[PDB]
Design a protein around this ligand. Structure first.
Ligand code: ZN
Ligand code: ZN
Ligand code: ZN
Lengths: 62, 59, 104, 86, 117, 151, 185, 128, 67
């Protein structure tokens, strides 16, 4: 920031493709999969909690 | 006020924070240490006077 | 007699540094086990020279076409260091440079 | 403060007018002195007449360099003189 | 005139701020965190170069002579080493209007002399 | 024209160029270069226009006013000319370069987007890219002005 | 921190990991490593900014890059033997990957192009009455590869006004043909 | 699995490599011309310094300063890390101290015979 | 997909020339000499034979609907 304010460096170009990244099928499906796996683990947490609160085992398949 | 102040808009915080405050919150309280981390060439007074307002604002 | 006969085979094609002799061979190895036994049974060698210029490896019924890459990064002086003289009697044969990569 | 002959001449300005403007904007509270327009360096020296003093000098420096109108009309940045061919 | 650098306390390593001692009528540099004081040696507290008369030769570094994308010339030999080839480039720095000026650097290794025509 | 631009560049590099009133040195250098290249484009266009016969069909359609202009003939026969982005020469989108094919700090005509070929001659790759940039400017203008003008 | 003045910073995927003293031979070592398909894979970008002493290395995804022919002193590394082995591509299984592994071709990303000096054709590598560069580092495989799928169908696109090429690139997509061989099913 | 099949399969290549060959693998259209039948220790060299361990690099038929490269150890704690140099005399020649630079397998036309002599440890020397 | 019957321009029959054209091409004729051997002298009919893409050969790689 000081180099830019002192004029010793050029401001960065927002449009330079060296400053950009292409979010392809893999990294996009990964974003989906993170959200969806988190939701799945949440649902598993509620389901298992409502069973262990009764002090008995539970079937992870269900 | 007098000169140009450097601030830092941290996440999850809705108010600007001086950079020196952030450096001290990370364990670097001495101004020498903070400018050792910021200014790597102590022979350059231009950088120094441009960071000085931030120090003067956080004492 | 003194020609470069250097080849660089990958891990799954490591041939034995000595001729196959029944007093130096033993049974120790067994889709999972199919790549395991092929290390000490298919791995003696005859590097065929064709007419197009390229070479190929002949260690049985399968043929692995090889390409004699000529590298100027590893110009090591390859030599038969046998323990006999002072410290490994390196015999001057051919300097290794060109590495032939075998593959299926 | 050190001036530069180029900008002094480009506006037909002299230290007399500048010093008058300073002594008018700040009255007698801010003494200013200066040499003639003959030295190789156009220099003029200010002092405060009677926050700490040095900070006050820095503040009035940063203010004078922005709001002290030596010549011209505010809000008019640049002016170009030319002959209209049309 | 030249700029003035920041100086730090010898105890708390915080910056020393300017102060005036009326008793001796002398400039001091004192820390507002600890109780350290020092006798100044410059007597100047602040310097603003509005003209920004900066020698950009100081901003150049000899390593730039290794850039394949810079132009090279054989017409401007080096005054320090006598090498013929030299890279040249413009200021390309903000706050410099007359920036068509060319800066030269010697491509000889370990010489790295920089100059301007 | 390219030698003239080289001369102006050499003058600017040697600080032998003084700015004109109302412009900075960069802007004065740009004005001189653009004037040289516009003069070159107009002179070449005049050469092409005078070369045309009475049987030329471009000249027929331009003369009748049915379609085309003398600048189109100049670009098809003589020279396509300077490509501009936002009213200036091709910007240094790389670091002090318009493309990786040029040296740094190259204010010459070909570096900054002067198409010294005609459409019949064919553009070189850098001329092709710069011309695509200039044409993209027109496409953007056509597609962006509509909403504001309709409002 | 006193060492950071003259030293060169090294960033890897944006993280400042350390500093170095001779960035030039570091870059030479890393480029040799990437061209040998050693620990550095081909898609890794390695930019040396010289004026500011950073060396930024990138391995993350999403970096658009393109292949280019590396250039020696003023010569291509693509010798005639590579073309010979490429001509019999279907017999000796000498493929593109062998061309990349030979250190003859390199993938350069947009950010590393800033540090690259390209030759549009090997004709640029010829010694000229007035040398433009004489220190090229890479060469285009062919400039026509700047075009995409639909612009690569235009014949003589460098003799058209560019809006025309854009309109065709849009209109090749509404053109009738046989969109796929198994259209009967 | 079993050894009675491994013995015959290992001998099987030793026998099949010696049959008649007249055809390629992918497209049997290329005719063969000839055949090249198949411890060790190679001293690597740096390409800038350009190292002349032998007289070949020096463009020499035989040693103009020696007659036998008596590759002797550098010390007692360095069997693989010897000191190869082309000096038959106790002369202060180029002392190339082959440091321990610890598959690169080597073979030769040993009179058209079936053997192998793969390398033990890639050493690399410098001008000491 | 298949060789047209007539030339689109003149109406000369080209449907009976595709197979002969291919046979001439495998006989080491140049495309021009092959087109001359078949009697295609107008560049329209030469266009018809020279620019034809036999897609039917690819459509016959799929098994039919009924055996
Ligand atoms: Zn203190
Ligand atoms: Zn020098
Ligand atoms: Zn016809």
């Amino acid at each position: 920031l000081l180099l830019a304010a002192l004029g010793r460096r050029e401001l960065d170009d927002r449009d330079h493709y060296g400053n950009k990244r292409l979010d392809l099928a893999g990294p996009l499906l990964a974003f989906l999969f993170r959200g969806m796996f988190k939701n799945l683990l949440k649902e598993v947490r509620i389901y298992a909690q409502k069973f262990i609160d009764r002090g008995k085992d539970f079937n992870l398949e269900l | 006020a007098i000169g140009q102040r450097i601030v830092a808009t941290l996440p999850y915080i809705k108010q600007e924070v001086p950079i020196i405050i952030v450096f001290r919150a990370l364990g670097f309280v001495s101004d020498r240490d903070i400018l050792e981390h910021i200014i790597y060439d102590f022979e350059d007074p231009e950088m120094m006077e441009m960071v000085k307002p931030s120090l003067d604002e956080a004492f | 007699g003194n020609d470069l006969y250097f080849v660089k085979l990958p891990n799954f094609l490591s041939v034995e540094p000595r001729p196959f002799d029944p007093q130096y061979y033993e049974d120790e190895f067994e889709e999972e086990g199919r790549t395991r036994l092929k290390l000490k049974v298919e791995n003696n060698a005859r590097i065929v020279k064709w007419s197009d210029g390229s070479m190929s490896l002949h260690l049985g019924n399968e043929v692995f076409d090889v390409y004699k890459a000529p590298l100027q990064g590893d110009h090591n002086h390859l030599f038969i260091r046998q323990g006999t003289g002072l410290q490994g009697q390196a015999v001057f044969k051919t300097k290794l440079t060109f590495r032939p990569h075998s593959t299926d | 403060v050190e001036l530069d002959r180029k900008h002094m001449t480009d506006r037909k300005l002299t230290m007399e007018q500048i010093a008058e403007k300073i002594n008018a904007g700040f009255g007698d509270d801010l003494n200013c002195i200066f040499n003639d327009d003959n030295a190789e360096k156009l220099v003029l020296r200010i002092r405060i007449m009677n926050m700490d003093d040095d900070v006050f000098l820095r503040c009035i420096e940063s203010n004078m360099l922005t709001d002290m109108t030596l010549q011209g009309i505010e809000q008019i940045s640049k002016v170009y003189m030319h002959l209209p061919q049309t | 005139p030249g700029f003035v650098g920041i100086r730090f306390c010898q105890e708390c390593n915080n910056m020393l701020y300017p102060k005036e001692d009326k008793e001796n009528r002398i400039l001091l540099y004192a820390c507002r965190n600890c109780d350290y004081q020092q006798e100044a040696d410059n007597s100047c507290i602040y310097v603003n170069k509005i003209t920004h008369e900066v020698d950009e030769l100081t901003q150049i570094i000899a390593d730039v002579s290794q850039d394949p994308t810079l132009p090279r010339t054989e017409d401007h030999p080096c005054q320090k080493c006598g090498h013929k080839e030299a890279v040249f480039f413009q200021s390309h720095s903000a706050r410099a209007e007359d920036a068509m000026r060319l800066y030269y650097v010697c491509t000889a290794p370990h010489c790295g002399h920089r100059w301007t025509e | 024209a390219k030698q003239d631009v080289i001369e102006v560049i050499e003058k600017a590099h040697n600080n032998e160029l003084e700015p004109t009133p109302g412009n900075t040195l960069r802007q004065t250098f740009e004005n001189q270069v653009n004037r040289i290249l516009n003069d070159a484009r107009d002179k070449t266009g005049s050469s092409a226009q005078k070369s045309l016969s009475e049987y030329n069909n471009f000249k027929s359609m331009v003369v009748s006013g049915a379609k085309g202009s003398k600048i189109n003939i100049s670009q098809v026969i003589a020279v396509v000319g300077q490509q501009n982005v936002e009213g200036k020469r091709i910007p240094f989108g790389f670091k002090h370069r318009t493309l990786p094919h040029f040296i740094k700090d190259d204010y010459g005509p070909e570096s900054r987007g002067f198409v010294e070929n005609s459409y019949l001659a064919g553009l070189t790759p850098t001329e092709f890219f710069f011309h695509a940039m200039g044409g993209r400017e027109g496409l953007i203008d056509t597609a962006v002005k509509t909403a504001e003008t309709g409002y | 921190p006193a060492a950071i003045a003259d030293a060169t910073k090294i960033f890897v995927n944006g993280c400042w990991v350390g500093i170095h003293k001779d960035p030039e031979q570091l870059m030479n070592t890393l480029r040799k490593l990437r061209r040998q398909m050693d620990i550095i894979v081909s898609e890794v970008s390695m930019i040396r900014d010289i004026r500011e002493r950073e060396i930024r290395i990138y391995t993350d995804a999403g970096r658009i890059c393109r292949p280019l022919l590396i250039v020696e002193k003023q010569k291509l590394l693509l010798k005639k033997r590579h073309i010979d082995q490429l001509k019999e591509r279907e017999y000796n299984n000498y493929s593109w990957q062998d061309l990349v592994a030979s250190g003859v071709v390199e993938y350069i990303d947009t950010l590393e192009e800033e540090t690259v000096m390209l030759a549009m054709t090997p004709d640029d590598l010829q010694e000229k009455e007035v040398a433009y560069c004489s220190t090229y580092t890479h060469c285009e495989i062919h400039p026509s590869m700047i075009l995409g799928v639909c612009a690569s169908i235009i014949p003589f696109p460098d003799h058209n006004q560019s809006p025309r090429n854009t309109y065709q690139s849009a209109m090749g997509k509404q053109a009738m043909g046989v969109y796929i061989t198994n259209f009967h099913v | 699995k079993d050894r009675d099949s491994q013995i015959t399969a290992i001998e099987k290549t030793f026998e099949d490599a010696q049959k008649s060959i007249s055809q390629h693998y992918s497209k049997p259209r290329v005719t063969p011309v000839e055949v090249m039948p198949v411890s060790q220790a190679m001293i690597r060299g740096m390409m800038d310094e350009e190292g002349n361990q032998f007289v070949a690099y020096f463009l020499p038929v035989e040693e103009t300063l020696k007659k036998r490269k008596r590759d002797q150890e550098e010390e007692m704690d360095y069997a693989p890390d010897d000191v190869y140099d082309y000096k038959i005399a106790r002369e202060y020649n180029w002392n190339v101290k082959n440091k321990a630079s610890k598959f690169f397998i080597f073979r030769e036309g040993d009179g058209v015979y079936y053997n192998e002599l793969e390398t033990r440890v890639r050493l690399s020397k410098r001008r000491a | 997909m298949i060789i047209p019957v007539r030339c689109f321009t003149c109406g000369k029959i080209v449907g009976n020339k595709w197979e002969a054209y291919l046979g001439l091409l495998q006989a080491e004729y140049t495309e021009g000499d092959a087109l001359d051997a078949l009697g295609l002298k107008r560049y329209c009919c030469r266009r018809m034979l020279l620019a034809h893409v036999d897609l039917i050969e690819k459509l016959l790689n799929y098994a039919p609907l009924e055996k």
